[PDB]
Amino acid sequence: IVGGYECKPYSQPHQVSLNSGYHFCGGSLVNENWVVSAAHCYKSRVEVRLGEHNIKVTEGSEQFISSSRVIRHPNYSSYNIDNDIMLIKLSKPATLNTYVQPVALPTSCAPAGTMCTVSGWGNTMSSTADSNKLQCLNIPILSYSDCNNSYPGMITNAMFCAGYLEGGKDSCQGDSGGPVVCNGELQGVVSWGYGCAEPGNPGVYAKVCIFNDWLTSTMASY
Ligand SMILES: NCc1ccccc1
Ligand SMILES: [Ca+2]
């Protein structure tokens, strides 16, 4: 996260760290057995770390659970990063408590201008911001028009832009797969962009609201 502030500890209880030796992507707990992340973060097996604030220090609130199934959206495309969403089933249910709580799936698509929170342990591009501690940032959803203007012909129905066209505040590598929460619901998954915090290049997020049927279906047949 670039240009944000350190999240208050456990203020984003749905935030998870996907670990394969080291943290490599974020994700969001949607229920006791399932985590939503970005399909480009795919690995056949991953360790989900919940209840984290500082990923390099034991705080006593962590729950480390290995995955049972990792399911990329059937139409994920590595050529253009389209339908960049994936589900991870936990091998054991997570224990919900003060440090671990799921985030609600969207009841509808958030309109342009809606203020959201994005968080993660990714590149901060700053000497003061310690990326080991969960970072937070408030970003507004941009209109499709603004999004297409920034990335002509690269925005599909499964993507939306959020952030500031003026730059300075944005998600970045390592935040990938993480949550974008607006009005208490998961509206986006950190997906891609050109650089981080560069003017004219806002972040691009997977549009969760159009995947509700795939998500709910998948979270019952598996
Ligand atoms: N600045 C958006 C972004 C997110 C994840 C990875 C690269 C870029
Ligand atoms: Ca920790």
Side-chain angles (χ1 to χ4, degrees), residues 1-2 122-125 170-176 190 195-197 205:
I1 298 292
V2 178
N123 281 189
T124 58
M125 299 192 141
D170 192 8
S171 54
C172 201
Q173 59 182 341
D175 291 323
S176 317
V190 182
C196 304
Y205 301 86

Side-chain angles (χ1 to χ4, degrees), residues 111-130:
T114 303
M115 181 56 55
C116 308
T117 296
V118 61
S119 52
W121 290 280
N123 281 189
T124 58
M125 299 192 141
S126 162
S127 46
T128 50
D130 180 7

